[PDB]
Subunit: 145 residues, 2 copies
Amino acid sequence: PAMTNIVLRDDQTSVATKTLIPIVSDGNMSVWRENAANVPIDGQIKLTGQWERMKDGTYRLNAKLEVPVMEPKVAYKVTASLTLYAPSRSTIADRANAMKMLSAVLCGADATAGTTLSPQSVTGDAWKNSALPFVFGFINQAFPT
Amino acid sequence: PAMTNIVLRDDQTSVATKTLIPIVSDGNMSVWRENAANVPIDGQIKLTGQWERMKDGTYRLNAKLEVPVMETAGVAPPKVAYKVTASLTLYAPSRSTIADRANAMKMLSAVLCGADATAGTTLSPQSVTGDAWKNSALPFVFGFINQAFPT
């Protein structure tokens, strides 16, 4: 399929919407980037999807989100990266099950079946105020013990 | 807080539940694992959370889900045939804040759950709808499952 915009929501008290527009693709790497006014290219949120069929037939797929913070010059950036390793014998079902289940972990699965926190929540600060296991864990840099 | 069970849903036509039980933590690394019948220890679904302070002060945080598939016998548990591994790594420099990390984790999670050209789009990773993930056209849902992203 052709790249489209990808529209995201941050966790601010008044949740802000980020629109990532298609920039470039070469068949195995595709780049989307925000086009916010008065921000240099190296300060824009950037999403990259890349994939490779490795020599042994395993597929390695990666989605990487980079959020730079400006001092200008870039002061630093936070990067979040999902890699899926799918050996040659793997099936559609294997990959769907694994992606769904890990996504559920990231969105706050816990000891009760079905628990989730929407990554499109309109509720400000809902992620930074969450006690859910891996939501709190990544944000506070410490997993359950 | 202490580890608890982590209960997940697969994408089967009748969605099935997986209960990952806390195994062990050493502060550096915490492990949960399913206890399905007739499956060897290395063949169980396994979730690992770990963190490392890099030499420049950046924290590298990782959550890894391993989903093994067993060989088919022609009951004692068969050998493991292969594993599909999905892993999320967060790189958080020393200057980064709680708000930085919350924003990035929320937004990448939204990508994985099917964000698209319309504000608010999401497919629940706890969906009770059978096959919803493998049937989806949403950009990074279809992309990971079919092993290629939009171009």
